[PDB]
Curated annotation (Swiss-Prot), chains A, D:
It comes from Rattus norvegicus (Rat). The gene is Grik2. Highest expression is found in the olfactory lobe, piriform cortex, dentate gyrus, hippocampus, granular cell layer of the cerebellum, and in caudate-putamen. This is Glutamate receptor ionotropic, kainate 2. Homotetramer and heterotetramer with GRIK5. Tetramers may be formed by the dimerization of dimers. Assembles into a kainate-gated homomeric channel that does not bind AMPA. Can form functional heteromeric receptors with GRIK4 and GRIK5. Can form functional heteromeric receptors with GRIK3. Interacts with DLG4. Interacts with NETO2. Interacts (via C-terminus) with KLHL17 (via kelch repeats); the interaction targets GRIK2 for degradation via ubiquitin-proteasome pathway. Sumoylation mediates kainate receptor-mediated endocytosis and regulates synaptic transmission. Sumoylation is enhanced by PIAS3 and desumoylated by SENP1.
Length: 23, 247, 103, 23, 50
């Protein structure tokens, strides 16, 4: 289930960077 | 063999164990060993109940509880969070229902329809047998194939109540319990045309022949043989077949 | 009581509260709403698939109610009294259920 | 019962938390 | 499984084996040199197993 966690935190870091860029 | 009869016209299969004792003519009918079974008495439809939930009374408890907390949410910032919490709680309920329905459907799709005779040979809940002191029982003794050897071993293990005396008792044994019979396919065709509640599962196991039983060493057998060959050339056997097997 | 390893939902809970409060302190709103809706749908779909697999594995293993159902079953081990009754019949049984039970 | 018992328990816990927040 | 249906699924010659693979849902079982000739000749079939 930790395979889902790795792509989940990669996409979480991507949306954090998207929030940082768009603001 | 005791010469109490000079002709036998009742349908007996031509086998090697009876060729060395008595004589037969040409087979007027061909034959195959097949398995009679009842139709599957399942597939409950939604004419009165269609089984919407799983754990249905506790599903009604879930519906009553969610209607009660909907009334509680109606009577009393926090409203958005509480509604979202009950929203993904209903998503959890929907996910659990989907998982249970998928498990039930995957269990229902992976089933054995006992079509072949080896599927009958594998299991022991479905009892089986044939007519006692017949050609099918004698064929299962001399069968060196391990599937029919296993079937004859299971028949001889419980021989007290699996070998009937007549095919009417065969119909009475198929129609109750979970019994399947191994007998002659023309009789199966007759009882499936007469009664549309049974199936012939599997194809013909091995071919045989319905000949005329004669005492051994007679020219009467040869005259009967030429008469049957000329009668099948005359085509009246087909007319008798279309007369008697229909209906 | 999931068969999957725990605390991944705790990671989702803490990250969800973090992205909720960094949404609260500030065209980007519908973008991050659709992104979080899609990722929670992914998490719900994975949880549903794991529950479906565990329920299918549980419903595949039926309770033992017959000898041939015990013979097809392999996790529960079985035996009898040696060198006497209910063993010599299993020594010389040619029925496939009892042959696979002698196995 | 079983899973649904835990569902009812977490529903009651969410109700108690909603009561505590709503004051 | 073959010998229980010995009069229905078993061929009499090699030409019956290749046509039953092409027509019906069926796999043949024979020596690999003839199968090598078939796979070099025909492209729609292949060899399975060692």
């Amino acid at each position: 289930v930790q395979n889902i966690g790795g792509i989940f935190i990669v996409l979480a870091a991507g949306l954090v960077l998207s929030v940082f860029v768009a603001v | 063999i005791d010469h109490k009869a000079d002709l036998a016209v009742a349908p007996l299969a031509i086998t090697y164990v009876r060729e060395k004792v008595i004589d037969f003519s040409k087979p007027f009918m061909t034959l195959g060993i097949s398995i009679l079974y009842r139709k599957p008495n399942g597939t409950n439809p939604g004419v009165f109940s269609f089984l919407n939930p799983l754990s249905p009374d506790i599903w009604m408890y879930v519906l009553l509880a969610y209607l009660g907390v909907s009334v509680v949410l109606f009577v009393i910032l926090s409203t958005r969070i509480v509604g979202g919490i009950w929203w993904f709680f209903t998503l959890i309920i929907i996910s659990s229902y989907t998982a249970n329905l998928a498990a039930f459907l995957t269990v229902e799709r992976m089933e054995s329809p006992i079509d072949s005779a080896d599927d009958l040979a594998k299991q022991t809940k479905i009892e089986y047998g044939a007519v006692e002191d017949g050609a099918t029982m004698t064929f299962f003794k001399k069968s060196k194939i391990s599937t029919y050897d296993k079937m004859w071993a299971f028949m001889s293990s419980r021989r007290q109540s699996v070998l009937v005396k007549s095919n009417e008792e065969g119909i009475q044994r198929v129609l109750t319990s979970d019994y399947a019979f191994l007998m002659e396919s023309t009789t199966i065709e007759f009882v499936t045309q007469r009664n549309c509640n049974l199936t012939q599962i599997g194809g013909l196991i091995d071919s045989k022949g319905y000949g005329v039983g004669t005492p051994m060493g007679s020219p009467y057998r040869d005259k009967i043989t030429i008469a049957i060959l000329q009668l099948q050339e005359e085509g009246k056997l087909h007319m008798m077949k279309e007369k008697w097997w229909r209906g």
